[PDB]
Amino acid sequence: ADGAALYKSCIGCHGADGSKAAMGSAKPVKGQGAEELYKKMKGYADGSYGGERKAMMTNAVKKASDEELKALADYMSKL
Numbered sequence: 512a513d514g515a516a517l518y519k520s521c522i523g524c525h526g527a528d529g530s531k532a533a534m535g536s537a538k539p540v541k542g543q544g545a546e547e548l549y550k551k552m553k554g555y556a557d558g559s560y561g562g563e564r565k566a567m568m569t570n571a572v573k574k575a576s577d578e579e580l581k582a583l584a585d586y587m588s589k590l
């Protein structure tokens with residue numbers, strides 16, 4: 512699959528232009544940067560980055576294999 516496909520679900524917590532209030536006050540995804548987003552999204556998928564509220568997101572992003580991980584960051588980096 513590829514990032515774009517996953518994001519469609521992600522809208523639930525991040526909104527379109529990755530800025531809605533997630534599980535409380537959270538940094539907006541809104542073009543942090545592909546580097547940042549990749550490392551953080553990778554962090555979550557791998558389980559290196561996370562926390563209580565992140566648990567849902569962790570499993571959500573966990574579905575992303577590799578193409579997906581990279582592309583999700585790339586996509587989010589222009590959103």
Ligand code: HEC
Pocket residue numbers: 517518520521522523524525533534535536537538539540543547548549551552564565567568571572583
């Ligand atoms: C709520 C139910 C969420 C779902 C589903 C998804 N994310 Fe999320 N995300 C959430 C929180 C609480 C935060 C914390 C950010 C902070 O530090 O305050 C985030 C943030 C991100 C980021 C930005 C990185 C950062 O700022 O630390 C990334 C890269 C991210 N989220 C990725 C991601 C993906 C790929 C999701 C859907 C495919 C997704 N999130 C859903 C809460 C929730």
